[PDB]
């Protein structure tokens, strides 16, 4: 049961999506015909339908912190929030993602990796920020030429995020594109970046 939230909203961590008792059981989810709370920050969720179908029928579920805020990101700023993902008249963000930006005027090249040791496959989501102007790009990630590299044994993307001013949606001209994969046991997923990576915080083992 998702109430006013979509699968996107529930699985990404929309603050207005307070479905947190989770569970391991339904076969079917639930949605409204036109859910109001999904991707609060505008952008494109890659393979949405495919996720909804693969997310139908879960026998065992749990939400765990794949990259914990306090220990995983020492060289970067993790406080990024938006007035588009607002919770109680107060700018917030996705609960299962982290908006990494610069700390002390730098964005150092990062390299993070998670080895699946849960016997079962873990659902990993992330994002890539596409700023509306080069100024925001420079202000946030301290480079003009960013790369985001998500690599596993069944998935391999080499992102080159581009500046584009898009029509204002939810008061924003910038976009965060949403991506996901299923990580099989024994496999290890490696994130590498120098900007624009909305990093995963919580994943899902099903």
């Amino acid at each position, epitope marked *: 049961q998702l109430g006013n939230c979509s699968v996107a909203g529930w699985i990404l961590g929309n603050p207005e999506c307070e479905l947190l008792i989770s569970r391991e059981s339904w076969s079917y989810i639930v949605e409204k015909p036109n859910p109001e709370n999904g991707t609060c920050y505008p952008g494109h969720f890659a393979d949405y339908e495919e996720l909804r179908e693969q997310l139908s029928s879960v026998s065992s579920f749990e939400r765990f912190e794949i990259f914990p805020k306090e220990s995983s990101w020492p060289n970067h700023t993790t406080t*990024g*929030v938006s007035a588009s993902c607002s919770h109680n008249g107060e700018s917030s963000f996705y609960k299962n993602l982290l908006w990494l930006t610069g700390k002390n005027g*730098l964005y150092p090249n990062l390299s993070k990796s998670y080895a699946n040791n849960k016997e079962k496959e873990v659902l990993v989501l992330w994002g890539v920020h596409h700023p509306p102007n080069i*100024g925001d790009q420079r*202000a946030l990630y301290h480079t003009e030429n960013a790369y985001v590299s998500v690599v596993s044994s069944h998935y391999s993307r080499k992102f080159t995020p581009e500046i584009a001013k898009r029509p204002k949606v939810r008061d924003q001209e910038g976009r965060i594109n949403y991506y996901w994969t299923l990580l099989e046991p024994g496999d290890t997923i490696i994130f590498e970046a120098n900007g624009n990576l909305i990093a995963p915080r919580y994943a899902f083992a099903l």
Partner: antibody
Amino acid sequence: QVQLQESGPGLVKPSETLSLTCTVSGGSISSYYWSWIRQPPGKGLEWIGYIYYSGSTDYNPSLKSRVTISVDTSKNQFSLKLSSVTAADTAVYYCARRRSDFETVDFIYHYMDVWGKGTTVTVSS
Amino acid sequence: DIQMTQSPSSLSASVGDRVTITCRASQSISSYLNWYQQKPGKAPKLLIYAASSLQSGVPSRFSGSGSGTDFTLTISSLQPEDFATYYCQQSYSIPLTFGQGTRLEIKR
């Protein structure tokens, strides 16, 4: 803690080129915009241009043809060159740091917080 | 592209007085305006960024306000040190334009 100092000649002959250097102390050129501003005597401020630490430039359209701003990370310095100078280029020239800042990523603004002491340049024969 | 216009050009106020000076943008700029204080023979000093944010090190008697096209710099209790030319500056787009300046004279 960070301080800037303009260096270069005070007198420059007409048609020749003005060359000013700014030296950064108490900090590094890393990740900021580095700009030049000038002020003719009794005449308010005119932005010349800036350079971003990665090399990118942005100049004032009224000077675009004559101006070259360069940065030298090797020596904590950045320079101004203004070609074919005329008496209209007689002014006090300032180097300054333009930094980006924000309280939340939804609102990202710039400002020039660190200024040099200004160097006086006269174009005369 | 954005022209900046200050008002008034010059004014004289007494010590203790509340002085307000205005900056105007030719087209909207929102909160992308900065204020500077220039004292004779010194470089310009940043007072307020983002239209209303007081810079660290600046006395709290300075306040910035406004959004869109019309802005105001306010000194709650004028002090003799505050004798200077005051400039507004837009940070909205290139080529970063300044106002023409307001000359604050102290009346005694």
